[PDB]
Amino acid sequence: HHHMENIKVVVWGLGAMGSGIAKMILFKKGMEIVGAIDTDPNKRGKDLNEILGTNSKPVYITSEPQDIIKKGSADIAVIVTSSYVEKVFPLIKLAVENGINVITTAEEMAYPSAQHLELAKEIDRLARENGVSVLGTGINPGFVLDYLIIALTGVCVDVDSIKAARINDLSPFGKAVMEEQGVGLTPEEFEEGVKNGTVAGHIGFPESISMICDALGWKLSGIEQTREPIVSKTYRETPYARVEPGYVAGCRQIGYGKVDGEVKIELEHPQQILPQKEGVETGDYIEIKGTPNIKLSIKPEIPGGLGTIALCVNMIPHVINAEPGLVTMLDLPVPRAIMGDARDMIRR
Amino acid sequence: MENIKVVVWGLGAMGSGIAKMILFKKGMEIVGAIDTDPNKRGKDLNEILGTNSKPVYITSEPQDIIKKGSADIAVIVTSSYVEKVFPLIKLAVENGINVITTAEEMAYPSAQHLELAKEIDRLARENGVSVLGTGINPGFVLDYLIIALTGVCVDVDSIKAARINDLSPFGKAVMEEQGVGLTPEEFEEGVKNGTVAGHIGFPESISMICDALGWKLSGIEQTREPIVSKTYRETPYARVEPGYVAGCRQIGYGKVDGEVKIELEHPQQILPQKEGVETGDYIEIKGTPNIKLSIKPEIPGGLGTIALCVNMIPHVINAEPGLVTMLDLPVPRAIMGDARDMIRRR
Ligand SMILES: NC(=O)c1ccc[n+]([C@@H]2O[C@H](COP(=O)([O-])OP(=O)(O)OC[C@H]3O[C@@H](n4cnc5c(N)ncnc54)[C@H](O)[C@@H]3O)[C@@H](O)[C@H]2O)c1
Ligand SMILES: NC(=O)c1ccc[n+]([C@@H]2O[C@H](COP(=O)([O-])OP(=O)(O)OC[C@H]3O[C@@H](n4cnc5c(N)ncnc54)[C@H](O)[C@@H]3O)[C@@H](O)[C@H]2O)c1
């Protein structure tokens, strides 16, 4: 109890999520930053406080992970870089080999066995052999279209099917996001955009669907997805995009989880600029068909960015406290805000 | 490889709902049914459930079936009070049997019964078993689910939440419990003498939230006012002409440094739709960000509690020994596979 050291965090990746996570860790009593890593030459060497506009014991961003990812130097690394297991696995490996807990936002890491069984097995072996835990989380995947749905099923005698949607407004975002979701394209330019990879859709549905089925004990016979344009019937314009009727207002990603060849789970993530233009309200919508039926909604949707920053930080005690190994949102206690001293949440 | 063996202690609305569910759940078995009601003592549980399965005879002597090795878990669905369920919990735990119970106070027994809670935790750890109180409210929608949403919040100012049902289909017992058809005069008279029970659980819910968030409570305050109809409302068990109490509204206030941080409200009334009132579970978290969640209609209190009790059985078995709350366990989930595959060995 006496002279508990602050939870020591390395933020690894300092883009949008890295920055927000760092700001929050500072603001939280019980946690402190001991390292900041990024490959960005613009950021190399700078004091973290300058990047975020804050006053604290200065931390100097390194492009070299290994002068902070050392044995016993930090409690937990927060890896906010790539979407893909194969691109954060080398970072995860380095962190756990030095006995450092890991939280990552990588969508594929929300349930890595869904698409990377052998790599997920290796993360678990490495985390166990080193006595630390690895968690992938986020708002989606990681919370609203998996963990939250799963929790609701806990009040059901029986679940027939699950249909859920998450709807946002792309209008605050810049050109890079517009191009990821095909805003402004023609339907035909959308198809080649998807087929060549400029249209990103949404990453994480195989992870979310697999997590649900494992949780409920369904055995998947297949996972299908579609990534199709949201063809506008109206005029919509923001500083970074202009869609006229017949042009693509955004991208609708759909995930189908199949049991015995039948759809038990359908997840939808339509992303577009200004859905108010055609009466589409933002929000997270969950419907459970079974005994009983359950219809939940959060309007507007839980903020993708703010929520992922908050959830990442809030899960730090749980990943530290968790038994060693790779963990998912199916293994940890309930998420919760840290309105007290984070040191009190550590199991000693 | 072997079925999860369950004893159901108490066979009322919840007990028989839970037994019927366990019967039809793969990997789960009822090995015993306890109830002191003479109209139930001695009967085949199937006679009560209306089911057609292997006979299980209801005993009123707990010692007949609560003994070392006879069950993995007892499900206690009798009283709302720690005082009244503690002897049952004690018997089951002293025989190495995990416990789940629906008793509202047991959702967070430290709130109002810290010393009893400490002893439950001690007996359970001494006997290598776990104890959990749960339910829809308290136990899920106005505590666990609220807490879960704050986990996406950078910072929480306050929490306000209401759960609204319709007492219409329930009957004379429940009507009198909620003061339906009374007078605002008899209502408070009913509250004082205890004939109007309102809702048990807000201290447990409010305390669970604070402990979860790291808030330190200055105190809990509760009101239990009536709901005066402006309308004629008639069910086969009540008649409420305008001016008379259509139901009871419970409100709980969690105060931190004297300021109100949590307000929970549970208006139970017949036919809320005869005025404008929509049923549902309503949660609003004021902070960064703000979150407004709505479950329409509300999670059915009876059916959801039956389901949640059964679904939590493997998590309580798998939990490490001692008293646990919904703050300690993995996420609730429906059991659509074989419950035996969920049992983890240490
Ligand atoms: N709900 C969710 O699951 C969720 C939510 C938000 C973000 N994400 C994912 O998290 C990741 C981070 O998102 P973001 O908004 O911070 O993106 P971003 O592009 O703003 O951040 C990327 C940063 O990481 C750095 N980086 C990249 N590779 C690196 C490496 N090998 N070593 C060190 N630094 C490296 C880059 O230089 C950049 O500064 C993205 O892949 C995103 O898809 C998931
Ligand atoms: N959300 C929640 O947390 C939640 C929801 C529903 C019910 N509950 C609680 O669970 C309890 C069960 O509710 P219910 O509707 O089934 O009540 P009920 O009155 O319908 O059934 C109670 C049964 O238990 C039996 N019983 C009582 N004391 C006993 C003893 N010492 N030994 C053996 N049998 C005994 C009675 O004979 C009766 O059949 C209630 O106290 C209720 O408040 C909680």
Length of chain A: 348
Query: Is the domain of A295 the same as that of A163?
Result: yes
The CATH number assigned to the domain holding B172 equals 3.30.360
Task: Write the burial class of residue A135 (CB in 10 Å: 0-12 exposed, 13-18 middle, 19+ buried).
Answer: buried
Strand partners, A94: none
- B99, B33 contact by CB (below 8 A): no
- B269, B247 contact by CB (below 8 A): yes
- A141, A111 contact by CB (below 8 A): yes
Selecting from A148, A309, A333 the residue whose C-beta is nearest the C-beta of B327 gives A333
Neighbours of A49 (CB within 10 A): 16
CA triplet A201, A202, A207: central angle to 5 degrees?
145
The whole-angstrom separation of Cα A137 and Cα A73 is: 23
* Tokens coding B163: 């759960």
The whole-angstrom separation of Cα A205 and Cα B145 is: 23
Amino acid at A325: G
Q: Is the peptide bond before B330 cis (omega within 30 degrees of 0)?
A: no
Give the method of determination: X-ray
Distances (CA, A) of A319 to A103, A327, A347, A348: 7, 8, 11, 14
A35 ligand 1 Cβ < 6 A? no
Query: Is the domain of A311 the same as that of A212?
Result: no
Please list, in sequence order, all residues whose beta carbon lies within 8 angstroms of the beta carbon of residue A225, skipping any fewer than 6 positions away.
A205, A206, A253, A254, A255, A256
Taking the CA of residue B186 and the nearest CA in chain A, the distance in Å comes to 37
Q: Which range of residues forms the domain containing residue B269?
A: 144-298
Strand partners, B101: B76, B133
The reply to whether residue A218 touches residue B287, judged by beta carbons under 8 angstroms, is: no
The reply to whether residue B330 touches residue A331, judged by beta carbons under 8 angstroms, is: yes
Q: Which of A181, A92, A185 is nearest to A132 (CA)?
A: A92
- The 3-class SS string of chain B reads CCCEEEEEECCCHHHHHHHHHHHHCCCEEEEEEECCCCCCCCCEHHHHHCCCCCCCEEECCHHHCCCCCCCCEEEECCCCCHHHHHHHHHHHHCCCCEEEECCHHHHCCCCCCHHHHHHHHHHHHHCCCEEEECCCCCCCCCCHHHHHHHCCCCEEEEEEEEEECCCCCCCHHHHHHCCCCCCHHHHHHHHHHCCCCCCCCHHHHHHHHHHHHCCCCCEEEEEEEEEECCCCEEECCEEECCCCEEEEEEEEEEEECCEEEEEEEEEEECCHHHCCCCCEEEEEEEEECCEEEEECCCCCHHHHHHHHHHHCHHHHHHCCCEEECCCCCCCCCCCCCCHHHHCCCC
DSSP A185: -
The whole-angstrom separation of Cα B336 and Cα B109 is: 31
- B152, A142 contact by CB (below 8 A): no
* Tokens coding A321: 């406290």
Selecting from B156, B327, B337 the residue whose C-beta is nearest the C-beta of A339 gives B156
Asked if the structure places residue A2 within a domain, the reply is no
Query: Is the domain of A234 the same as that of A270?
Result: yes
The reply to whether residue A153 touches residue B342, judged by beta carbons under 8 angstroms, is: no
Domains in chain B: how many in total?
2
The whole-angstrom separation of Cα A135 and Cα A109 is: 7
**Three-class secondary structure of residue A265 per DSSP:** strand
The whole-angstrom separation of Cα B334 and Cα A211 is: 13
Q: Which of A21, A44, A81 to mutate to test the pocket of ligand 1 (most atoms within 8 A of CB)?
A: A81
* Tokens coding B197: 């029970």
CA B242 centroid distance within chain? 32
Neighbours of B210 (CB within 10 A): 23
Work out how many CB contacts closer than 8 A connect A with B: 165
Query: Is the domain of B251 the same as that of B121?
Result: no
The whole-angstrom separation of Cα A61 and Cα A14 is: 9
Strand partners, A263: A258
Query: Is the domain of A195 the same as that of A86?
Result: no
- B71, B4 contact by CB (below 8 A): no
The whole-angstrom separation of Cα B341 and Cα B2 is: 10
Neighbours of A128 (CB within 10 A): 16
How many angstroms does the Cα of residue B198 sit away from the middle of ligand 2?
A: 16
The whole-angstrom separation of Cα A154 and Cα B312 is: 8
- B31, B58 contact by CB (below 8 A): no
Query: Is the domain of B273 the same as that of B173?
Result: yes
Query: Is the domain of B150 the same as that of B287?
Result: yes
Query: Is the domain of B148 the same as that of B163?
Result: yes
* Tokens coding A141: 């995947």
Q: Is the peptide bond before B289 cis (omega within 30 degrees of 0)?
A: yes
Strand partners, B28: B4
- B90, B22 contact by CB (below 8 A): no
Annotated binding site of B for NAD(+): 13-14, 35, 40, 78, 80, 102, 104, 137
Selecting from B153, B292, B337 the residue whose C-beta is nearest the C-beta of A337 gives B153
Orientation angle between helical segments A85-97 and A117-129, nearest 10 degrees: 10
The whole-angstrom separation of Cα B202 and Cα A308 is: 30
The whole-angstrom separation of Cα A241 and Cα B340 is: 54
Task: Write the burial class of residue A203 (CB in 10 Å: 0-12 exposed, 13-18 middle, 19+ buried).
Answer: middle
The whole-angstrom separation of Cα A313 and Cα B1 is: 40
Strand partners, B177: none
The whole-angstrom separation of Cα B178 and Cα B226 is: 8
Asked if the structure places residue A320 within a domain, the reply is yes
Neighbours of A175 (CB within 10 A): 12
Distances (CA, A) of A127 to A84, A86, B232, B305, B306: 18, 16, 65, 37, 38
Strand partners, A291: A158
The reply to whether residue B293 touches residue A291, judged by beta carbons under 8 angstroms, is: no
CA B150 centroid distance within chain? 22
How many angstroms does the Cα of residue A121 sit away from the middle of ligand 2?
A: 45
Asked if the structure places residue A1 within a domain, the reply is no
Nearest ligand 2 atom to alpha carbon B139? 3
Radius of gyration of chain A, Cα coordinates, nearest whole angstrom: 21
The whole-angstrom separation of Cα A179 and Cα A195 is: 14
* Tokens coding B270: 């017949």
Query: Is the domain of A333 the same as that of A197?
Result: no
Distances (CA, A) of A272 to A69, A229, B127: 40, 9, 57
Alpha helices in chain A (DSSP H): 16-27, 48-52, 85-97, 117-129, 147-153, 175-180, 187-196, 205-216, 304-314, 316-321
Output the DSSP codes for A86-132.
Answer: HHHHHHHHHHHHTT-EEEE--GGGGSGGGT-HHHHHHHHHHHHHTT-
Strand partners, A107: none
Selecting from A217, A297, A338 the residue whose C-beta is nearest the C-beta of B341 gives A217
The whole-angstrom separation of Cα A338 and Cα A102 is: 19
Query: Is the domain of A67 the same as that of A153?
Result: no
* Tokens coding B92: 């089951």
- Sort out which chain B residues have CB atoms less than 8 A from A155's CB and list them: 136, 140, 299, 303-304, 307-308, 311, 332
The whole-angstrom separation of Cα A75 and Cα B232 is: 63
The reply to whether residue B214 touches residue A345, judged by beta carbons under 8 angstroms, is: yes
The whole-angstrom separation of Cα B196 and Cα B255 is: 25
Q: Which of B1, B21, B4 is nearest to B13 (CA)?
A: B21
The CATH number assigned to the domain holding B18 equals 3.40.50.720
Nearest ligand 1 atom to alpha carbon A137? 3
Ligand nearest to the CA of A94: 1
Q: Which of A344, A185, A162 is nearest to A273 (CA)?
A: A185
Please list, in sequence order, all residues whose beta carbon lies within 8 angstroms of the beta carbon of residue A109, skipping any fewer than 6 positions away.
A85, A88, A134, A136
Length of chain B: 346
Query: Is the domain of B154 the same as that of B287?
Result: yes
Query: Is the domain of B309 the same as that of B266?
Result: no
The whole-angstrom separation of Cα B9 and Cα B36 is: 10
Please list, in sequence order, all residues whose beta carbon lies within 8 angstroms of the beta carbon of residue B125, skipping any fewer than 6 positions away.
B321, B322
